[PDB]
Amino acid sequence: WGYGKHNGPEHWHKDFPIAKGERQSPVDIDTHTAKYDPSLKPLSVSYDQATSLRILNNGAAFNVEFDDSQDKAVLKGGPLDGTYRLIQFHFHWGSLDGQGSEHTVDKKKYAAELHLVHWNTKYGDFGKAVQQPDGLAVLGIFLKVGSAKPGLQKVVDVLDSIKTKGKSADFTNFDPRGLLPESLDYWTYPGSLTTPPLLECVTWIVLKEPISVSSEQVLKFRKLNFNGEGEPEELMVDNWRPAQPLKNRQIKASFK
Ligand SMILES: [Hg+2]
Ligand SMILES: [Zn+2]
Structure with a gap:
């Protein structure tokens, strides 16, 4: 599976029939159809004890991975029941600034989208959590191009060391608080992973306020490779799944 003509999102259903399921992601967020939900509790993003470990090119994106062996960086509140532990973040992005986001x-379409992936600690590990309908919570944040994001620059600067699929580098002491916008106003709906295996386990929380990054920052994303070392070079661009049918879902807003 991949993002090309012969293996991209319109082909995924053959190996992963849940691609045509009842609660697939991403979706278009129709802001006038979403409804303000007073039942939502305040969202709590507690990242001050986050422990980043490594950055990995997995051939689909690059993942910044965290130590999730203790409750050190967690998401709570909002639509969530219980505590969700941060395991990794990654981005999706375009070949041009006019596309790249998964949600719309x-x-x-925004230039890029950041996904902070969390698992519900009552299930003990990520692998058990993805067997559960409420196993995961993904915090999604749009990126627009304008001013640089200072807290992204450490990520940008290490990308040259993980150019190709399967490469990793130490990435300790990175603070994901530097990737968050001022406001935590959000939309939320039930959906799925946006790459194979496309599992329907995710409570999506998508922030309304984008972060601004510079053209030079996103240009460095686009210098990564989908291929392995010594393979013909295929730039890692347009690694986003388009919007999927909303089906029997409602999107709720935390803000009126
Ligand atoms: Hg699931
Ligand atoms: Zn993602």
Whole structure:
């Protein structure tokens, strides 16, 4: 599976029939159809004890991985029951600034999208959590191109050391608080992983406020490779799944 003509999102259903399921992600967020939900509790993003370990090119994106062996960086509140532990973050991005996000907002595509992936600690590990309908919570954050994001630059600067699939580097002492916008206003709906195996285990929390990154920052994302070392070079661009049918879902807003 991949993002090309012969193996991209329109082919995934053959190996992963849940691609045509009832709660697939991403979706278009129709802001006028979403409803404010007073039942939502305040969202709690507690990342001050986060322990990053490594950065990995997995051939689909690059993942910044965390030590999730203790409750050190967690998401709670909002639509969530219980505590969800941060395991990794990654991005999806475009070949041009006009596309790259997975979710869309009134059909608007952003240049990129950040996914902070968390698992529900009552299931003990990530692998058990993805067997559960409420196993995961993904915090999604849009990126637009304008001013640089200072807290992204450490990520940008290490990308040259993980150019190709299967390469990793030490990535300790990175603070993901530097990737968050001012506001935690959000939309939320039930969905799925956006790459194979496309499992329907995710409570999505998508922030309304994008972060701004510079053109030079996103240009460095686009210098990564989908291929392995010594293989013909295929730039890692347009690694996003388009919007999927909303089906029997409602999107709730935390803000009126
Ligand atoms: Hg699941
Ligand atoms: Zn993702």
